[PDB]
Amino acid sequence: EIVSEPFAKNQLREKARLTNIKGLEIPRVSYTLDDDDFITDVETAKELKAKGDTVKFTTNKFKVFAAISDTVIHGSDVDLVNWVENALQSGLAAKERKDALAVSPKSGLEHMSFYNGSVKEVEGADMYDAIINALADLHEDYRDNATIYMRYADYVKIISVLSNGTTNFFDTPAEKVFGKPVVFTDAAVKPIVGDFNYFGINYDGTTYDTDKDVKKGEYLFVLTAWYDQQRTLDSAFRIAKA
Amino acid sequence: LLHALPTGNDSGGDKLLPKTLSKEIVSEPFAKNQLREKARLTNIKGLEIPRVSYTLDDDDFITDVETAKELKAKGDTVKFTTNKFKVFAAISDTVIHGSDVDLVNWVENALQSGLAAKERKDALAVSPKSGLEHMSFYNGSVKEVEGADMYDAIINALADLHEDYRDNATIYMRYADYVKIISVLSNGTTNFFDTPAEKVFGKPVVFTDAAVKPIVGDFNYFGINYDGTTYDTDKDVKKGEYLFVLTAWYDQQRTLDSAFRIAKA
Amino acid sequence: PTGNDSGGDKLLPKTLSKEIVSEPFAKNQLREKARLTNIKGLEIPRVSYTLDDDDFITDVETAKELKAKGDTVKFTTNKFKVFAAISDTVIHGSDVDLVNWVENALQSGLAAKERKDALAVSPKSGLEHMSFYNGSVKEVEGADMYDAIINALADLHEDYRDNATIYMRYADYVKIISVLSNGTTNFFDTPAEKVFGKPVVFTDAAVKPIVGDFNYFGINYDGTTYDTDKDVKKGEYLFVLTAWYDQQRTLDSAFRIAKA
Amino acid sequence: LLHALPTGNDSGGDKLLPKTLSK
């Protein structure tokens, strides 16, 4: 009987939080120390003042589909059970990663993306300089917990300049070059970096349905849900650029 | 093409979602002190540990080291002295009544994280402040050595140290500096990035971003303690905020300052 | 912190519903006087009775319409559809509109369908015979609205007069007062029964005041059917209802118009 | 999107009509 792989996945689910709570509200600033605090970084003064202390997780709709013609049903195969779950679950993942890493987001969902704007682009001479400088920019608390996302091909080019003749960092991991964990993803254009503790997602509710289009002779299996994902603090996550 | 009325609002699609969903907020500590591993911790009140040990009635009145004698002339004992602390949490009003969640970890992760950030900051402070000068390694009490490059410096740092203290020595430095040391050594030879850091210098290493200059020495002498804590809640009515606040008392001092050094180029 | 439980609910008012409710969105004023029926097929005679030999000739009108239409009257089915649409988010936000919001909605749809057709200035084709302004009613002419209504009563037959009723828009009932201002006296406080001498009902659609014996006018609803379905893709439930009715005038000569 | 055959012709919408009907 039939089986297959996850057709698509979201790499960002590794580090980000994931929730199922109906309405969700958290504070942005975890703690403040005693009187002898050097002034909080100019950034956090601005965004905290503008956004407010809390953060709103606000429902947003979409729809996922699935279509099976009638002949396929009546040829002794069982795709009703597994082919759809393999299909719909993947649809949830691609919807996320498309919106977060959108170069030019659709309207009504700008605030989710990391490339919509409102993040500072540092400038390194090459990719190796830009990533290390970007770590040099953000606040140190975020640095200690930071994580990098990038495309694997860019990790090859930094090796060609760190070829150094005899030595070959094709065998080395990527943790030890930059000094922090790395995850590889093809959509991420400009290497982004920050503490992905703060980034978070929430799924509130769903509903599963099925129906037959009698004339055209195709079953349907549809699902819907509402989610949203926001950055607790924009000042954390930063860009690298040549 | 059915006639039923979904009044119940029970959702069948819930199981299709990823099974890693939390239903309760959780996160890791925001900050941590990386000195706690090597150094000594204590809860007792009013601590005093003598500097002296190992007297011989020697006719060869040379002690161990010239630096060791002249700075014991400072004093016989060390006495840790109390210093004040303050920690604030600030969960607001909407979050409490807006929805049913649980924040006890969010508070806990915030408070005892704040302690570690305090004691690391002052102990590694570049420019100390009033009353706090007597714990920072970058205070002028401790020496600088001078290698031509930072590699030979750390060697010349671990070199001019007591035989004993060398044995359980330990190094602190930034990782970014640690890379430049190796990109130059890897020229025309084996790779070192696959190697542990214990071996290029011979002894264990820990990495933190604070140490603008390296440290070397045995941190069994560096010591910390906490006298006792105070915890109480509070509500500001006019604004709506709930306040969770902590205060305790502490000090940290090094037993002997000759056991530690600074490398520099 | 235990939760958002508090004692403010006592301070909160007592008029709070805890679930949704609303008014009839629209109504048909004509249902007060007209007959209303549920019979499958309905047939009645037009002329109630005739007296003995000494009957002055029946009014020229009734001779004509009775001769043309015939003795009986046919109630003939005519279709329409009423709709209702609820998006999916509205369902899944803990509210109960399934039970009351629809009945409040559909029942109103029946009423507006009636009054639209009866008082239609220019009816849709296939349903001309229902309206009162399609034609076939005589328009008397008064110098003002007060003269036109009273003259219109002077026109129709007296049996219908004794049982007659007037429908009009309230604003026209104000203008007749301004001419009957008479200085000191003010008929804003008076009812309208006593000015014209017969009952009155107020309605905004009725343009030219109509008048006659609304015993004769009648309505019938034969059958219905209630259905529901989901448009899966667009994610909206539906609640639809249908029925067949018709309403006719037993005798056209009764109901008359007033005009300036 | 149901499979049933309404043979009975019993009408559920009857009660929605006004309750002042005469018969």
Author numbering:
A (entry chain C): 152 to 393
B (entry chain B): 129 to 393
C (entry chain C): 134 to 393
D (entry chain B): 129 to 151
Q: Which sentences from the paper describe this structure?
A:
Staphylococcus aureus pathogenicity islands (SaPIs) are molecular parasites that hijack helper phages for their transfer. SaPIbov5, the prototypical member of a family of cos type SaPIs, redirects the assembly of ϕ12 helper capsids from prolate to isometric. This size and shape shift is dependent on the SaPIbov5-encoded protein Ccm, a homolog of the ϕ12 capsid protein (CP). All tailed bacteriophages (order Caudovirales) package their genomes into preformed procapsids made from capsid protein (CP), with a ring-like portal protein (PP) forming a unique vertex at one end of the capsid.
An icosahedral reconstruction of the procapsids from 28,566 particle images reached a resolution of 4.0 Å (FSC = 0.143). 3D classification of the data without the application of symmetry (C1) indicated that only ≈1% of the shells had portals incorporated, and no further attempts to reconstruct in C1 or C5 were therefore made. These procapsids show the expected T = 4 organization with hexamer/pentamer clustering, and at this resolution secondary structure elements and many side chains were clearly visible, sufficient to model with confidence the proteins that make up the capsid. Cycles of manual model building and real-space refinement demonstrated conclusively that the pentamers (subunit A) were made of Ccm while the hexamers (subunits B–D) were composed of CP. One striking difference is the exceptionally long, extended N-arm in CP, especially in subunit B, where the chain could be traced all the way from the δ domain cleavage site at residue 129. The Ccm N-arm is rotated by ≈80° relative to CP around a pivot centered on CP residue L163, and folds behind the P-domain where it points towards the interior of the shell. Other major differences include the E-loops; unusually, both proteins have an α-helix within their E-loops, but the location of the helix is on opposite sides of the E-loop hairpin in the two proteins. In contrast, intercapsomeric interactions are sparse and mostly mediated through the P-domains, which interact around the icosahedral threefold axes (formed by three C subunits) and the quasi-threefold axes formed by A, B, and D subunits between two hexamers and a pentamer. At the icosahedral threefold axis, the N-arms from three B subunits come together to form a triskelion-like structure. Our results suggest a model for size redirection in which preferential incorporation of Ccm pentamers prevents the cylindrical midsection from forming by imposing a constant curvature on the capsid shell assembly.
